[PDB]
């Protein structure tokens, strides 16, 4: 309590959303400088989506087959190519609202804001976490493909996700802005299973640090652990093992509280092995795993 | 089913920084007027009992520094409306959206664009609590951040931020400067009335969970409206009105679950708890989705 999922302001990304139509298939695209990025399955008929031959489908296409619109204003396409599972449509106008940006590929556990779009028009913005099985729990309906996920650092938009599909379990899958899927998924209208999901350990630790920052520290014990010993125990409770990068991104919170990362790991290990015992942390018996160390600092320190 | 804020770009283009003395907060720049909390004019030794009319008449236009990014805006006049200051500037904001000022009802939801030094930092969904607080995320310098809804291309501004309470919740005004609730823009520790849970919103969220294939909490029973309300009031839930039942019609139809049947489900949850189980990931009954919110996100 005192914490909520907070998205980044969406305006810089709103200014880049367009619609891309092939035939009657419409989805969203991202217009940066003179290129529009979108999922390559825009070129598919519904009957092609079963087992599309994207390469053969693309050679039958010409620039004049792609309808790109910002609102009702057509953007003329002057070139096209495919990079992994994304289509890059060169257009004759550089987007005057292009922010400073980069394309980043995120790691599981990292959070990002999603600007859910339909027909090139934004509907809503919300925060998502990349699960360890490389799915996200989005709120995506038909026509949402091409909606993007992003973080904003200073003036710079880091695009990290483009939406492509839904799985039998109702979670969602997609690519980075270079078209490489997160996880083992493919853009075919076939049934695909996500791996068993696990709890995001690094984010649980961030949450415990947040509890400590707010004076809730009953769970701190007098012991420590090695990273390997912690990782082996953690996996028995369906928690992700920590990476070295996880240890490093906890550094600022460790410094803020003076609690070594591996000491917090020992406290978490005791919570896993011994349970909560009816106690709460930040007002809950459940450990939250969708706040990153960066999210915690934003809401504790501003 | 996620807590979804409105896209914030139309509001971002209106946020500016307002400084007076050593106080800095945010303003909302629409056409040639900047709206901001009037306590920007207060010093430390003013905040305990500020006679705002007396403090404001002693101010000159040049005492207000307004910055939109790298550009200073020249203040050419000012007036006060309740707890909001209106600074006339010599430049019109070309990014002014179509907009209106509305006062929202308790139980209604809105998006908050949290800003610091006139720079937008985050966006999230809040409800106006029955006790007229909001459970926000606001730090030092967030005052003048606004709350809003969007209908078509029209931004309806309903909230401007002024203060935090010792319990950690928040209070503020509409854009006419009238507080929601019994709060006052003086530097005192203020308590709210007893909060209650927004029952119509809990019911909407239970329907949402069903829509998403989750129905462990349903049961074979029903209840009358009044018997439900007796139990609701016992657990500090708001009463359900017939208008609320009507409003839930579309969700009832979509799911084939009569409103009063869902009320009997909620009654069971209030009396039996959730006993470890969770709904839509939550171990608590969520009451900051309205029926409209649930529908807008299943469409
Ligand atoms: C693109 O807008 C769309 C969004 C999907 C559709 C509904 N919810 C979403 O997130 N993506 C697709 O239609 C996608 C196209 C293929 C070629 C990648 N296919 C898809 O997501 O099919 C899913 C298969 C499993 C079930 C039937 C459970 C849901 C649809
Ligand atoms: C304006 O930016 C600021 C925002 C507050 C500060 C901390 N979190 C917020 O939301 N509002 C004020 O400083 C406000 C000014 C008066 C004149 C209305 N005062 C205020 O909020 O005081 C609170 C009293 C209780 C405690 C100390 C718990 C928090 C500050």
XYZ file of C-alpha atoms and ligand atoms in Angstrom:
661
model
C 0.000 0.000 0.000
C 1.179 3.470 -0.911
C 2.408 1.981 -4.208
C 0.503 1.720 -7.483
C 1.336 0.844 -11.057
C 2.242 4.159 -12.687
C 2.724 4.540 -16.433
C 4.946 7.061 -18.139
C 3.162 10.000 -19.767
C 2.134 8.745 -23.176
C 2.152 11.940 -25.231
C 5.533 11.459 -26.908
C 4.388 8.004 -28.091
C 0.888 9.173 -29.063
C 2.578 11.511 -31.521
C 4.093 8.496 -33.288
C 1.057 6.221 -33.680
C -0.390 5.565 -37.133
C -2.481 2.864 -38.766
C -1.264 0.421 -41.413
C -3.751 -1.391 -43.627
C -3.331 -4.173 -46.164
C -6.595 -5.118 -47.818
C -9.015 -5.144 -44.892
C -6.398 -6.003 -42.233
C -5.648 -2.899 -40.142
C -3.231 -2.627 -37.259
C -1.068 0.039 -35.674
C 2.378 1.238 -36.615
C 5.062 3.436 -35.087
C 6.198 6.418 -37.165
C 9.725 7.615 -36.330
C 11.601 9.941 -38.692
C 10.599 8.638 -42.173
C 9.985 4.998 -41.221
C 6.833 3.250 -39.994
C 7.347 0.033 -38.003
C 4.582 -2.543 -37.666
C 3.994 -6.281 -37.310
C 4.619 -8.144 -40.526
C 1.389 -10.119 -40.255
C -0.432 -7.045 -41.581
C 0.297 -8.631 -44.985
C -1.668 -11.779 -44.083
C -5.188 -12.678 -44.933
C -6.890 -14.566 -42.110
C -6.379 -17.763 -44.128
C -2.669 -16.943 -44.482
C -2.311 -16.600 -40.706
C -2.435 -20.380 -40.123
C 1.050 -21.020 -41.580
C 2.086 -17.875 -43.445
C 4.966 -17.873 -45.907
C 5.985 -14.318 -45.041
C 8.781 -14.197 -47.626
C 6.485 -15.272 -50.470
C 3.750 -12.940 -49.219
C 6.161 -10.002 -49.176
C 7.458 -10.483 -52.725
C 3.905 -10.233 -54.042
C 3.580 -6.868 -52.257
C 4.400 -3.441 -53.644
C 4.711 -0.030 -51.999
C 1.288 0.947 -53.347
C -0.383 -1.967 -51.517
C 0.257 -0.380 -48.083
C -2.169 2.219 -46.731
C -0.474 4.159 -43.931
C -2.575 6.835 -42.249
C -2.062 9.361 -39.463
C -5.679 9.880 -38.608
C -7.367 10.218 -41.989
C -4.227 11.629 -43.662
C -2.454 9.168 -45.936
C 1.328 8.786 -45.690
C 2.823 7.719 -49.019
C 5.002 4.577 -48.790
C 8.235 4.742 -50.809
C 9.946 1.516 -49.729
C 9.399 -1.607 -47.702
C 11.467 -4.309 -46.046
C 11.089 -7.021 -43.416
C 13.384 -7.301 -40.375
C 12.597 -10.450 -38.382
C 8.858 -10.147 -37.570
C 8.499 -6.394 -38.213
C 7.831 -4.538 -41.423
C 9.699 -1.282 -42.048
C 7.785 1.009 -44.396
C 9.778 3.968 -45.650
C 7.474 6.992 -46.037
C 7.881 10.298 -47.811
C 7.428 12.467 -44.669
C 9.619 12.647 -41.577
C 7.407 12.657 -38.484
C 7.711 16.177 -36.988
C 6.700 14.769 -33.576
C 9.538 12.194 -33.514
C 11.008 12.218 -29.993
C 14.536 11.430 -29.055
C 14.389 7.638 -28.982
C 16.182 4.331 -28.867
C 15.215 0.707 -29.406
C 16.008 -1.464 -26.388
C 15.472 -5.146 -25.691
C 14.423 -5.605 -22.079
C 15.002 -8.492 -19.651
C 12.280 -10.437 -17.818
C 11.175 -8.590 -14.720
C 11.545 -5.176 -16.343
C 8.417 -3.051 -16.503
C 7.242 -0.739 -19.243
C 4.226 1.309 -20.202
C 1.873 0.121 -22.945
C -0.120 2.577 -25.041
C -2.999 0.383 -26.196
C -4.120 1.550 -29.642
C -6.874 0.680 -32.116
C -6.998 2.017 -35.687
C -4.018 4.244 -34.927
C -5.895 5.908 -32.018
C -4.807 5.543 -28.383
C -7.324 4.023 -25.984
C -5.363 3.817 -22.703
C -1.975 3.522 -21.055
C -0.891 1.054 -18.382
C 2.158 -0.555 -16.844
C 3.204 -4.128 -17.739
C 5.950 -6.410 -16.474
C 7.797 -8.836 -18.731
C 7.285 -12.217 -17.044
C 10.137 -14.755 -16.774
C 8.357 -16.862 -19.395
C 8.496 -13.868 -21.792
C 4.787 -13.087 -21.746
C 3.021 -9.984 -20.516
C -0.377 -9.651 -18.861
C -1.763 -6.996 -21.162
C -5.269 -5.860 -22.000
C -5.264 -6.332 -25.763
C -8.226 -6.885 -28.084
C -8.563 -7.430 -31.814
C -6.841 -4.627 -33.680
C -4.330 -3.864 -30.910
C -1.311 -5.305 -32.735
C 1.424 -2.779 -33.300
C 0.740 -1.087 -29.968
C 4.091 -0.474 -28.300
C 5.643 -0.654 -24.874
C 8.181 1.899 -23.733
C 10.085 3.626 -20.952
C 11.042 7.301 -20.868
C 14.446 8.374 -19.508
C 14.934 12.167 -19.409
C 13.699 13.232 -22.882
C 14.390 9.871 -24.532
C 11.779 7.223 -25.329
C 13.165 3.678 -25.156
C 10.848 1.470 -27.188
C 10.998 -2.119 -26.008
C 7.835 -3.954 -27.099
C 5.494 -4.252 -30.072
C 2.366 -6.344 -29.694
C 1.685 -9.359 -31.962
C -0.515 -12.002 -30.338
C -2.457 -13.635 -27.514
C -1.897 -17.097 -26.049
C -4.431 -19.748 -24.967
C -3.968 -18.693 -21.318
C -4.954 -15.081 -22.078
C -1.466 -13.581 -21.744
C 0.284 -11.753 -24.567
C 3.419 -12.073 -26.692
C 5.399 -9.813 -28.980
C 8.726 -8.534 -30.235
C 11.209 -5.767 -29.675
C 11.365 -2.999 -32.271
C 13.880 -5.053 -34.291
C 11.171 -7.701 -34.697
C 12.725 -10.390 -32.481
C 10.131 -12.117 -30.314
C 10.562 -12.253 -26.592
C 10.498 -15.942 -25.762
C 10.080 -18.940 -28.032
C 6.972 -17.678 -29.830
C 6.244 -17.243 -33.551
C 3.725 -15.075 -35.419
C 1.456 -17.885 -36.643
C -2.214 -18.374 -35.802
C -1.280 -21.617 -34.021
C -1.712 -22.707 -30.417
C 1.481 -22.038 -28.470
C 2.167 -22.620 -24.790
C 4.118 -20.310 -22.534
C 6.566 -21.956 -20.184
C 5.565 -22.276 -16.561
C 5.786 -18.826 -15.075
C 7.876 -18.011 -12.017
C 8.007 -15.192 -9.470
C 10.256 -12.232 -10.284
C 12.772 -12.434 -7.454
C 14.572 -9.191 -8.197
C 11.300 -7.289 -8.000
C 10.269 -9.002 -4.758
C 13.586 -7.866 -3.291
C 12.904 -4.340 -4.552
C 9.556 -4.544 -2.761
C 11.221 -5.594 0.504
C 13.617 -2.656 0.152
C 10.574 -0.406 -0.376
C 9.066 -1.818 2.824
C 12.286 -1.034 4.700
C 12.401 2.516 3.297
C 8.917 3.017 4.783
C 9.892 1.694 8.230
C 8.430 -1.830 7.837
C 11.394 -4.062 8.594
C 10.345 -6.929 10.899
C 11.617 -9.481 8.345
C 15.274 -8.381 8.386
C 17.344 -11.188 9.958
C 20.967 -11.345 11.134
C 22.251 -13.673 8.405
C 23.482 -13.668 4.826
C 23.860 -16.141 1.989
C 25.784 -16.764 -1.174
C 24.051 -16.004 -4.452
C 24.311 -19.621 -5.563
C 22.825 -20.985 -2.327
C 19.996 -18.455 -2.567
C 19.357 -19.306 -6.217
C 19.120 -23.024 -5.480
C 16.600 -22.502 -2.666
C 14.635 -19.913 -4.648
C 14.019 -22.305 -7.535
C 12.397 -24.785 -5.154
C 9.715 -22.123 -4.437
C 9.168 -21.285 -8.122
C 11.201 -18.064 -7.816
C 13.545 -16.989 -10.601
C 17.271 -17.223 -9.900
C 19.059 -13.904 -9.661
C 21.546 -12.771 -12.291
C 24.534 -10.518 -11.724
C 22.544 -7.777 -13.494
C 19.799 -8.219 -10.877
C 22.318 -7.762 -8.078
C 23.593 -4.587 -9.748
C 20.197 -3.002 -10.336
C 19.433 -3.505 -6.609
C 22.576 -1.502 -5.827
C 20.916 1.884 -5.352
C 18.283 0.515 -2.948
C 20.946 -1.422 -1.062
C 22.925 1.824 -0.713
C 19.824 3.795 0.315
C 19.017 1.333 3.129
C 22.497 0.045 3.981
C 21.237 -3.531 3.580
C 23.528 -5.670 1.406
C 21.718 -7.403 -1.432
C 22.760 -10.854 -0.171
C 21.544 -10.008 3.331
C 18.147 -9.166 1.876
C 18.324 -12.472 -0.031
C 18.745 -14.250 3.302
C 15.691 -12.440 4.687
C 13.635 -13.442 1.657
C 14.862 -17.030 1.929
C 13.564 -17.169 5.500
C 10.202 -15.805 4.344
C 10.010 -18.525 1.690
C 11.008 -21.343 4.044
C 9.087 -20.189 7.122
C 6.182 -18.311 5.538
C 4.653 -15.023 6.610
C 3.071 -16.250 9.879
C -0.021 -14.088 9.412
C 2.116 -10.953 9.314
C 2.038 -8.386 6.528
C 4.578 -6.342 4.592
C 3.447 -2.931 3.363
C 0.000 -4.049 4.491
C -0.233 -7.354 2.628
C 0.586 -11.017 3.142
C 1.382 -11.306 -0.575
C 4.765 -10.326 -1.976
C 4.521 -8.026 -4.990
C 6.728 -8.888 -7.976
C 5.830 -6.283 -10.636
C 7.649 -3.251 -9.172
C 11.248 -2.947 -10.330
C 14.020 -1.283 -8.336
C 13.557 1.723 -10.629
C 9.791 1.775 -9.988
C 10.370 1.722 -6.226
C 12.795 4.640 -6.300
C 10.425 6.693 -8.471
C 7.601 6.342 -5.950
C 9.664 6.569 -2.753
C 12.063 9.339 -3.778
C 10.554 10.984 -6.875
C -8.062 -6.771 -16.998
C -5.788 -3.879 -16.003
C -6.129 -0.450 -14.416
C -5.943 1.773 -17.494
C -5.360 5.530 -17.588
C -6.426 7.790 -20.432
C -3.666 8.791 -22.854
C -2.134 11.896 -21.320
C -0.669 13.795 -24.272
C -3.430 16.388 -24.522
C -2.835 17.271 -20.855
C 0.984 17.165 -21.085
C 0.857 20.016 -23.583
C -0.781 22.197 -20.940
C 1.545 21.692 -17.965
C 3.763 24.589 -16.886
C 5.830 25.570 -13.858
C 4.707 28.371 -11.527
C 7.045 29.918 -8.972
C 6.401 32.574 -6.350
C 9.161 33.356 -3.893
C 10.629 29.972 -2.985
C 7.439 28.010 -3.685
C 7.270 26.072 -6.956
C 4.415 23.919 -8.211
C 2.628 23.122 -11.479
C 0.089 25.076 -13.468
C -2.429 24.211 -16.169
C -2.135 26.536 -19.207
C -5.355 26.707 -21.255
C -5.713 29.419 -23.903
C -4.178 32.490 -22.190
C -4.796 31.512 -18.544
C -2.664 29.422 -16.169
C -4.563 27.732 -13.326
C -2.696 26.701 -10.187
C -3.158 26.199 -6.443
C -3.329 29.515 -4.654
C -1.020 28.386 -1.830
C 1.924 29.063 -4.157
C 1.768 32.642 -2.775
C 2.332 31.496 0.817
C 5.569 31.647 2.755
C 6.383 29.305 5.629
C 5.024 31.770 8.229
C 1.855 32.163 6.105
C 0.696 28.567 5.738
C -0.773 28.111 9.235
C -3.624 30.624 8.762
C -3.333 32.299 5.339
C -5.693 35.207 4.709
C -5.497 34.594 0.987
C -7.360 37.713 -0.204
C -5.005 39.820 1.920
C -1.911 37.946 0.731
C -2.962 38.135 -2.921
C -3.719 41.858 -3.076
C -0.103 42.474 -2.038
C 1.213 40.556 -5.046
C 2.233 41.998 -8.399
C 2.121 40.266 -11.763
C 5.927 40.123 -11.857
C 6.032 38.158 -8.584
C 4.785 35.119 -10.536
C 7.371 33.288 -12.635
C 5.706 30.983 -15.162
C 7.871 28.734 -17.329
C 6.720 26.522 -20.198
C 9.841 24.479 -20.841
C 12.623 26.906 -21.735
C 10.254 29.865 -22.246
C 9.028 32.271 -19.585
C 5.419 33.422 -19.929
C 4.656 37.017 -18.975
C 1.875 37.308 -16.393
C -0.341 40.296 -17.299
C -3.024 39.866 -14.655
C -4.301 37.556 -11.974
C -7.477 36.635 -10.124
C -8.475 34.075 -7.495
C -11.425 31.688 -7.710
C -11.851 29.809 -4.432
C -8.581 27.860 -3.909
C -7.283 28.270 -7.506
C -5.260 31.187 -8.846
C -5.826 32.220 -12.468
C -2.781 33.887 -14.041
C -3.510 35.676 -17.318
C -0.523 35.460 -19.663
C 0.254 37.307 -22.882
C 0.528 34.103 -24.943
C -2.131 31.584 -25.921
C -1.262 27.909 -25.639
C -1.541 26.494 -29.178
C -1.767 23.000 -27.689
C -4.958 23.804 -25.744
C -7.324 20.847 -26.272
C -11.067 20.992 -26.421
C -11.913 20.916 -22.732
C -14.420 21.429 -19.974
C -14.301 21.716 -16.188
C -16.438 19.188 -14.321
C -16.966 18.294 -10.684
C -16.964 14.528 -10.282
C -19.058 12.420 -7.946
C -17.610 10.101 -5.302
C -17.070 6.670 -6.808
C -16.205 8.061 -10.251
C -12.726 7.521 -11.639
C -10.239 9.743 -13.426
C -6.661 9.739 -14.649
C -3.966 11.687 -12.791
C -1.012 13.230 -14.643
C 1.542 13.603 -11.876
C 3.965 16.455 -12.584
C 6.995 18.041 -10.887
C 8.430 21.444 -11.874
C 5.932 21.577 -14.717
C 7.265 18.318 -16.195
C 4.920 15.306 -16.494
C 6.301 12.242 -14.691
C 3.571 9.581 -14.472
C -0.029 8.753 -15.237
C -2.411 6.579 -13.273
C -6.054 5.953 -12.487
C -7.682 7.102 -9.215
C -11.192 7.159 -7.820
C -12.847 9.943 -5.867
C -13.327 8.194 -2.512
C -16.711 8.352 -0.747
C -14.930 10.440 1.917
C -13.625 12.726 -0.879
C -9.984 11.770 -0.582
C -8.008 10.113 -3.360
C -5.415 7.403 -2.888
C -2.808 9.098 -5.034
C 0.933 8.967 -5.506
C 1.975 12.562 -4.944
C 5.287 13.864 -3.572
C 6.669 17.316 -2.782
C 6.164 19.642 -5.728
C 3.232 17.709 -7.231
C 0.661 20.406 -6.468
C -1.170 21.624 -9.534
C -1.085 18.186 -11.087
C -4.540 17.535 -12.517
C -7.015 14.711 -12.911
C -9.153 14.227 -16.000
C -11.298 12.037 -18.215
C -11.419 12.088 -22.018
C -14.606 11.757 -24.074
C -13.996 11.857 -27.843
C -11.449 14.689 -28.209
C -12.696 16.631 -25.151
C -10.667 16.639 -21.930
C -12.880 16.983 -18.846
C -10.703 18.305 -16.023
C -12.058 17.311 -12.623
C -9.194 17.512 -10.071
C -6.246 19.704 -9.136
C -3.860 18.555 -6.441
C -3.260 20.524 -3.209
C -2.294 18.368 -0.197
C -1.512 15.091 1.545
C -3.048 13.859 4.767
C -1.167 12.147 7.603
C -2.715 8.788 6.590
C -1.011 9.083 3.188
C -4.090 9.844 1.067
C -4.583 13.077 -0.850
C -6.947 16.001 -1.232
C -7.599 18.720 -3.751
C -10.143 20.720 -5.676
C -12.090 20.897 -8.873
C -10.930 23.438 -11.427
C -13.237 26.041 -9.893
C -11.071 25.749 -6.782
C -13.649 24.107 -4.509
C -12.255 21.281 -2.410
C -13.603 17.812 -2.547
C -14.360 17.084 1.085
C -13.966 18.987 4.342
C -10.367 20.005 3.733
C -8.712 23.410 3.786
C -5.571 24.734 2.100
C -3.740 25.560 5.317
C -0.633 23.817 6.625
C -2.279 21.541 9.203
C -2.593 17.810 9.757
C -6.119 16.995 8.608
C -8.176 13.830 8.990
C -10.919 12.638 6.667
C -14.281 11.150 7.453
C -14.571 7.380 7.637
C -14.026 5.912 4.241
C -16.319 3.316 2.753
C -15.993 0.919 -0.153
C -17.541 1.772 -3.539
C -19.938 -1.152 -3.854
C -21.099 -0.599 -7.433
C -17.425 -0.633 -8.456
C -16.674 -3.868 -6.586
C -19.589 -5.488 -8.408
C -18.324 -4.191 -11.767
C -14.902 -5.679 -11.048
C -16.356 -9.068 -10.095
C -18.159 -9.046 -13.443
C -14.842 -8.186 -15.098
C -13.279 -11.230 -13.444
C -16.050 -13.454 -14.821
C -15.644 -11.948 -18.304
C -12.000 -13.038 -17.959
C -13.027 -16.619 -17.187
C -12.731 -16.445 -13.391
C -15.853 -17.344 -11.414
C -14.868 -19.257 -8.257
C -16.641 -16.654 -6.072
C -20.098 -17.173 -7.661
C -22.748 -19.096 -5.734
C -26.238 -20.504 -6.225
C -28.010 -17.927 -4.067
C -29.653 -14.546 -4.477
C -30.538 -11.634 -2.222
C -32.926 -8.746 -2.164
C -31.524 -5.280 -2.717
C -32.370 -4.157 0.812
C -30.965 -7.249 2.534
C -27.776 -6.803 0.552
C -27.597 -3.142 1.564
C -28.058 -4.033 5.241
C -25.011 -6.294 5.093
C -23.085 -3.878 2.892
C -23.565 -1.035 5.349
C -22.469 -3.300 8.200
C -19.124 -3.825 6.428
C -18.764 -0.097 5.614
C -19.735 -0.564 1.981
C -21.799 2.100 0.237
C -25.446 1.217 -0.390
C -26.371 0.042 -3.859
C -29.086 2.120 -5.505
C -31.491 1.040 -8.220
C -29.612 3.365 -10.587
C -26.489 1.349 -9.775
C -28.377 -1.847 -10.601
C -29.482 -0.311 -13.914
C -25.926 0.831 -14.656
C -24.742 -2.754 -14.163
C -27.312 -4.009 -16.693
C -24.918 -4.398 -19.627
C -22.423 -6.409 -17.589
C -25.248 -8.558 -16.238
C -26.520 -9.236 -19.763
C -23.063 -10.006 -21.170
C -22.420 -12.586 -18.421
C -25.895 -13.976 -17.758
C -25.470 -13.175 -14.065
C -28.249 -11.155 -12.483
C -27.091 -8.128 -10.554
C -28.642 -9.363 -7.317
C -26.999 -12.744 -7.868
C -23.619 -11.009 -8.029
C -24.680 -9.169 -4.867
C -25.176 -12.533 -3.183
C -21.681 -13.475 -4.361
C -20.242 -10.295 -2.872
C -22.196 -10.851 0.336
C -20.559 -14.289 0.661
C -17.104 -12.786 0.106
C -17.688 -10.151 2.768
C -18.823 -12.751 5.306
C -16.498 -15.635 4.357
C -13.439 -13.720 3.156
C -11.394 -14.899 0.189
C -9.456 -17.498 2.211
C -6.181 -17.364 0.314
C -7.802 -17.214 -3.119
C -7.407 -14.097 -5.286
C -9.511 -12.341 -7.919
C -7.794 -10.922 -11.015
C -4.500 -11.252 -9.157
C -5.778 -9.321 -6.124
C -6.218 -10.588 -2.573
C -8.493 -7.599 -1.834
C -11.806 -6.488 -3.312
C -10.986 -3.745 -5.823
C -13.331 -0.754 -5.906
C -11.716 1.751 -8.303
C -13.159 0.409 -11.575
C -16.515 1.847 -12.577
C -18.999 -0.101 -14.719
C -18.060 2.158 -17.644
C -14.358 1.471 -17.030
C -14.890 -2.298 -17.192
C -16.936 -1.974 -20.381
C -14.585 0.469 -22.118
C -11.845 -2.157 -21.643
C -13.920 -5.130 -22.824
C -14.641 -3.185 -26.048
C -3.336 -8.275 -33.596
O -4.146 -7.148 -33.411
C -3.947 -9.462 -32.836
C -4.254 -9.217 -31.335
C -4.674 -10.417 -30.616
C -6.078 -10.790 -31.036
C -6.873 -10.815 -29.914
N -6.015 -10.402 -28.657
C -4.758 -10.164 -29.042
O -3.881 -9.853 -28.335
N -3.074 -10.607 -33.042
C -3.499 -11.774 -33.780
O -4.595 -11.852 -34.208
C -2.493 -12.899 -33.967
C -2.083 -12.943 -35.433
C -1.003 -13.988 -35.664
C -0.652 -14.115 -37.140
C 0.234 -13.633 -34.855
N -3.059 -14.180 -33.617
C -3.523 -14.490 -32.287
O -3.246 -13.818 -31.362
O -4.319 -15.617 -32.138
C -4.560 -16.015 -30.831
C -4.414 -17.534 -30.787
C -4.873 -18.137 -29.461
C -6.250 -17.647 -29.032
C -7.319 -18.287 -29.920
C -6.503 -18.090 -27.595
C -6.366 -16.127 -29.082
C -5.964 -15.572 -30.441
C 2.152 20.687 -3.002
O 3.126 20.258 -3.915
C 2.163 19.833 -1.737
C 2.043 18.311 -2.009
C 2.055 17.470 -0.820
C 3.447 17.478 -0.237
C 3.752 16.183 0.111
N 2.779 15.216 -0.669
C 1.794 15.944 -1.210
O 0.903 15.526 -1.839
N 1.120 20.291 -0.839
C 1.459 20.909 0.417
O 2.586 21.023 0.751
C 0.323 21.374 1.312
C 0.306 22.896 1.339
C -0.816 23.427 2.221
C -0.728 24.942 2.366
C -2.174 23.001 1.681
N 0.530 20.883 2.653
C 0.508 19.475 2.964
O 0.153 18.673 2.175
O 0.926 19.108 4.238
C 0.863 17.753 4.522
C 0.512 17.621 6.003
C 0.601 16.185 6.507
C 1.931 15.526 6.160
C 3.046 16.134 7.013
C 1.846 14.044 6.490
C 2.274 15.663 4.680
C 2.210 17.108 4.202
